[PDB]
Amino acid sequence: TAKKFKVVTTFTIIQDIAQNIAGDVAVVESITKPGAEIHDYQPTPRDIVKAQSADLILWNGMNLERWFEKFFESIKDVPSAVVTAGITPLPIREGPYSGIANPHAWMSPSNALIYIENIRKALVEHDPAHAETYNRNAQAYAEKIKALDAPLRERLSRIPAEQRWLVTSEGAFSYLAKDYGFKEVYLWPINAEQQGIPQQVRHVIDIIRENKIPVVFSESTISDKPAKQVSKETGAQYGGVLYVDSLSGEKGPVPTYISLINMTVDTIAKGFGQ
Ligand SMILES: [Mn+2]
């Protein structure tokens, strides 16, 4: 066991999934730090150094990392793999990114199994000496992720179908909402320039009052102020922060991809009174 195979990912969700597949034969590190906004992140010379010293670079694609392809052109002779191949996208519904793929596919546990398979194939291709370890680790982790779905589905099923309205800041929850039958209301369709402008807030407020939706949420890498503004003006309680674009730090409450799915579903369910 000389030097461990080095994997660099764009952001922390992929880092944790890939580190579960890598086990102890590879070290996986994220370019973005926990808590940092991932869509419009601006890479630094230090990021170039991290990617250039990698043996493999992983990214989401599906229009997530607006920075990645320009960044990756600086990187020489490091292979890359997009980890969303074979996932059927949901289009963004409005705004200047309307009609392109919603990137947040990892929020569907079923989609996470495809992430796992894509990361497995990439590690097996570019570090074939350890293919057996990658294959064994991916099969074990896919088992955990597959088993994850049923208790989450049952928990959210307790909410009456008619009242399944998921009101968030970014429209980052479309894939989770589809899996578990939530209608989707958000202050902005995808992180970009306009985030909490009028017209956005007033539409969401109208939807809330018409349907008496009991809770609204923010997310961990953006400002909670628009969501709190919405809850102040309506009957809706502020449900807290959901996790989608980033894990917490390893010593925080959301250190892993499994903990992120569990925490986000728990917080939603609690916002509805379980
Ligand atoms: Mn996002």
Side-chain angles (χ1 to χ4, degrees):
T1 309
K3 208 199 169 216
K4 286 183 187 339
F5 195 77
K6 209 189 283 142
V7 188
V8 171
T9 76
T10 44
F11 76 119
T12 60
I13 274 69
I14 291 179
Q15 187 279 334
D16 184 68
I17 294 173
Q19 189 62 82
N20 274 281
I21 299 158
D24 75 307
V25 296
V27 176
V28 187
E29 299 192 357
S30 175
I31 288 172
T32 65
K33 80 166 176 60
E37 202 292 301
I38 66 176
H39 296 251
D40 295 315
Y41 175 76
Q42 302 289 300
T44 68
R46 291 164 193 189
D47 301 327
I48 295 175
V49 163
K50 186 169 261 208
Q52 184 64 68
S53 65
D55 300 292
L56 174 60
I57 293 169
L58 302 178
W59 63 306
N60 192 83
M62 301 183 58
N63 323 293
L64 178 65
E65 309 96 330
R66 300 199 182 100
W67 47 279
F68 178 71
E69 300 101 297
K70 293 181 311 287
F71 169 75
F72 186 60
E73 284 174 10
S74 300
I75 309 313
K76 172 89 192 155
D77 293 345
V78 182
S80 65
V82 56
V83 301
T84 54
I87 291 174
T88 304
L90 293 169
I92 298 170
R93 298 194 299 211
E94 65 279 89
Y97 302 96
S98 63
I100 71 179
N102 187 321
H104 304 90
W106 61 86
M107 293 304 286
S108 158
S110 297
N111 281 350
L113 299 173
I114 295 177
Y115 276 80
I116 289 160
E117 171 63 7
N118 288 335
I119 295 165
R120 186 201 65 76
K121 291 190 302 180
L123 288 163
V124 161
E125 172 183 340
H126 300 283
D127 187 26
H130 296 119
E132 305 221 338
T133 298
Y134 298 133
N135 286 344
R136 174 141 90 123
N137 290 345
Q139 178 190 280
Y141 191 63
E143 258 175 44
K144 276 144 199 165
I145 295 314
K146 184 194 181 309
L148 191 57
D149 181 68
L152 307 166
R153 188 173 303 271
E154 187 275 321
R155 180 104 192 259
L156 297 175
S157 76
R158 292 179 209 167
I159 305 167
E162 191 97 328
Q163 301 195 317
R164 278 181 214 150
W165 292 89
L166 183 50
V167 188
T168 59
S169 301
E170 182 181 34
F173 299 91
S174 314
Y175 295 85
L176 185 155
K178 185 192 133 217
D179 282 18
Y180 304 131
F182 278 77
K183 310 156 270 216
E184 181 183 358
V185 187
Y186 41 80
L187 291 164
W188 53 90
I190 184 164
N191 290 359
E193 57 280 311
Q194 298 151 84
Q195 286 183 187
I197 61 167
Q199 171 34 45
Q200 297 185 315
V201 180
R202 301 186 250 98
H203 175 254
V204 163
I205 283 176
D206 289 357
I207 285 267
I208 293 302
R209 288 165 170 169
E210 163 86 341
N211 294 98
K212 295 279 232 191
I213 300 158
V215 61
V216 308
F217 302 95
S218 72
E219 305 85 53
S220 70
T221 73
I222 47 83
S223 176
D224 66 355
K225 283 176 173 47
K228 288 185 149 148
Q229 189 41 34
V230 165
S231 73
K232 180 170 181 143
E233 296 192 27
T234 63
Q237 68 167 356
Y238 172 58
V241 353
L242 310 177
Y243 281 81
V244 48
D245 283 3
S246 176
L247 307 182
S248 69
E250 59 249 45
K251 295 173 184 179
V254 188
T256 67
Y257 170 66
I258 287 167
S259 75
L260 176 149
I261 295 295
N262 276 326
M263 174 68 71
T264 285
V265 165
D266 285 10
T267 304
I268 288 172
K270 276 175 188 170
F272 279 92
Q274 309 171 254

